[model samples]
Target: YRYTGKLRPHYPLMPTRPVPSYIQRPDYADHPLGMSESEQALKGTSQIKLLSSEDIEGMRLVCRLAREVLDVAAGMIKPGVTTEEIDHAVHLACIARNCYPSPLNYYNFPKSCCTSVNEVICHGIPDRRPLQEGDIVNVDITLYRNGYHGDLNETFFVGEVDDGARKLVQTTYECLMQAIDAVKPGVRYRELGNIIQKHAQANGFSVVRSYCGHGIHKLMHTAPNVPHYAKNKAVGVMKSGHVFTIEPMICEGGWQDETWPDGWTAVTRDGKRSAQFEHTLLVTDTGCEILTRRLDSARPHFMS
Candidate 1:
């Protein structure tokens, strides 16, 4: 067993599934090396692009579709379900909507959606393991359509959860909401980390330092990396039309993390539970709009 708990990952991950021929694939889909030359070139610079009116409208459609896909996946979570089943549901859902699952073959990632369970922090690949009672799983979904990307994630309870697990998920959601609330024209990107870190630490949790949020548009990940901890030096300022995500991965123990042998699953070093929530935002002249906002009926049942 990797960790001292019941949360062991099931083995023998499935091979990457084939996308429908008619579906438009990302540039890296055909490239075995995962990243295309043009994609690499775009990563070389940290310049943030301001979205035009046309770009914002395109983003809205994709972001709304992403929310619909996530809701479909979330509805299937239970004590006896395998994450692979979840991935399959997500795959079919995306194709039905005529959108591409952004995480598939992303840097060689095998799954179409991320199912991070319990101690697993993020990028937890969907597998054959059957979820058990009292488990908390984070379902991360991103989709690319009409030349833009929409990203969001939420931690869900398999059945019943302990107090600690519920608290972690609740606080993580609040961190994203507060950070998004702090966004406005001329607000420094670095200020987000302060707001997120303060709220997380105030509730006896630690913010993860390894993975930060990113600007999302045509590319899966792009400029203006957003950190979740305090004292970070991230550059850039919020301006009208700026689109990005503020996802905070908060842990119940030491913020440090370790990756599984699969090289995609990231778990807590202390084997403590971690939770996260994400929302893609569109910076407005006044404040911001959540591109991935959920429908009222779509909120997790536990949150009510």
Candidate 2:
């Protein structure tokens, strides 16, 4: 296929790996089309689950595990490592903890995790392409454990990068953090888009609207869609116990996207770089708790 950016799809993705029989898998794990029955049932519904304290505990456990799995993939950022190899490592790290990698077969996604590189905005399927120096890659990881789901992603510098790329990445990080800062009780879910939009544009970047973060719990994807662009119509107000992700996909050029023929990856229409950051947050009475907050040791590797 003719490509949109410098990156091209490397085909013949590895076959889907297996989960141990003792491990619990999502409804879509073996489905022909990777349809999650829970997600399908929630279609056309807007009611976000208010996680109970026990449910909160489950989320905390899974989100922490998800962070470690992401870091495992992050550690493989140097040139010459193929994305599929990262996917293989992620799958191993997940089952070792008795957790199911949520993205596997979820909506027919082939990989255990998402490896979006360079101009690809999101859902870049894992394949055989090796990391190149100066390339930026996003490793999106989710884990299902003890009946709860956790989601998050962070873009990493493959090695040394250009100043323009660094600024785009740093601004994308701020877009997510600032929107996260607005997550106290009673804040409109829509207001997050406003915060993200303003911050991204002020830095001379644009926000991709094709994808929005969603409420996650027992279901891999759920209600109360969270948009990351201004003037969006996303409904509902933040309440204590609400669990959701705030991921902003900031583009270095136009906000538009073009999907790869693979039917999953979304790339920048202008072939310019796009960066993203995600966190699963639980709204507390006074503020919010980052369920997938990184450990102190992980902070210095990539400055927040």
Candidate 3:
């Protein structure tokens, strides 16, 4: 039954958490008016935004906090724990650090974090359903602090997992790490997909095509969308100071995906397992720096 490949949504997502009025919110927090005109104007432009030293420093600070928040959330995963509980803990962690939970109300997303379980590929809405044993979930956390955003996620095992599940998670993470290692000044943005896709396919997994990584800095999502499939038409060349994420979602079934009626949760169409890993990176003069790198003490046990 655990390998039936069907993942059911636990209904009735809890209400969104309230941010203290004092905490700064992202421009898209308000419903109708999306990102500020300045940020919106960059859409579809192939030119990547390069960060200055000051901007990169800001990113470093926020990214560090994001990693801490993600680690705290990951510690709470296990059977009988609701995703909503994890979301609340993440919201409070952001408040304690004086940062805003970026996902809250961004395009009306109700949860502070995204909890994609099992066959769910991405953008899963955190809800009251308790995680079951053998379940794999991806907890995506993005927060805004000091006028910049830090975003990252890691797929975690709920309890003891099957070999199939473990292989999927490990290979998906390897896809992300390999793609990141290829980043450097003048590398084509499209080249990342080549590295990621080859690794996934070689391991008998498929890469999800619906969602791709994007430039992240002052805004939650920005230009230079990076797809994770080979032969993708993604544009732009990496330049020193470009900050982006190379998260890859790999599936044990076909790469095709479908959205739930909730309109946000993306799940594998064939109901197979999926796993993902993400990191915010800064293009250095020589190579790249993982702005959201986890502390040595916080590396996931399975990663070792």
Candidate 4:
């Protein structure tokens, strides 16, 4: 394959980790193609899901679980540690909590979490590659518990990184934070794109177009499509009880991307670095709550 970035595929991926029988699994967990029949049923539909109080409670619990899982995996990120090792930690963390790793076996994704490095945008399958000094990686984690799914990700520094890479990651984080700050009842979902894009461009970065945020709930992905660029036609209006994710993929180069032969990883077209951050949200009558909010104490350990 004509590789678009410095990263290359590491062959001989490890076999899938086993999930305990006691844990609840998604409908697609055991499917032949990791197909989500529930998602398939919602195809071509644009209606956004509105969660009840009980449903919100389910999301609250799962989102906390998801945040904890992300912290465990992220705490292990650093030089010489393989993405696969972090994934192993993620898998063990989920099972220990009696929660199912949301990405595993969904449409045949082979890992418990996604580890996107450098130019990689998203859906990066974990493998045998060891993270090197000066590398930046994104760990996307999700968990399913009591029927709701909580999704989130963050780009992390492997070790001492260059100023430019640090800027890219920081800018991407602001894109998500600034967008999240704009969430409220009656806001159009499409308007988020401009909030994200403006911040990215102002910082000399480009917002990724190939992937956008989506409404996440019992099904991994659902309606009220969200794009991260300006002038998009994404339809849907935010309202109280609405739940979703706002993940902005910001790149140092062009916004275009290409997938690997393995058919999952997405990397930048110009081979420049990329970064992303995500959060599951609950739109309330006032503003929004970051359902997957990180612990106040832990986020800075790696950056320190």
- Candidate 3 per-residue lDDT over residues 152-264, each given as its tens digit: 99999988999999999989988988898889999999999999989999999999998999999987788789999999999899989999998999999899988887778
What lDDT does each candidate get? Answer: 0.89, 0.90, 0.88, 0.90
Every model: Cα RMSD to truth: 1.5, 1.2, 2.5, 1.2
Q: Which sequence of candidate numbers ranks them by TM-score, best first? A: 4, 2, 1, 3
Stretches > 4 Å off in candidate 3: 1-5, 33-38
Candidate 2, 1-304: lDDT as tens digits = 6687899888788788989988888889878999987788879898878988999999999999999888888888788899999999999999998999999988789889999999999999999899998999999999999888899999998878999889998899888989988889999999999999999989999999999989998987787899999999998989999999998999999999989888899999999999999999999999999988887564523473
Tens-digit lDDT string for candidate 4 (176-249)? 88899999998999899999999899988998898989898898899877999998999889999999999999
TM-score of 3: 0.95
Candidate 1: where are CA atoms >4 Å away? 1-6, 298-301
lDDT measured at residue 273 in model 4 versus the true structure, 0 to 100: 88
Best by lDDT: 4
Question: Cα deviation of 131 in candidate 2 (Å)?
Answer: 0.5
Clashes of 2: 0
Clash pairs, candidate 3, are none
1 or 3, greater by lDDT:
1
Who is ahead in TM-score, 1 or 4? Answer: 4
Superposition error at 287 for model 2 (Å):
0.7
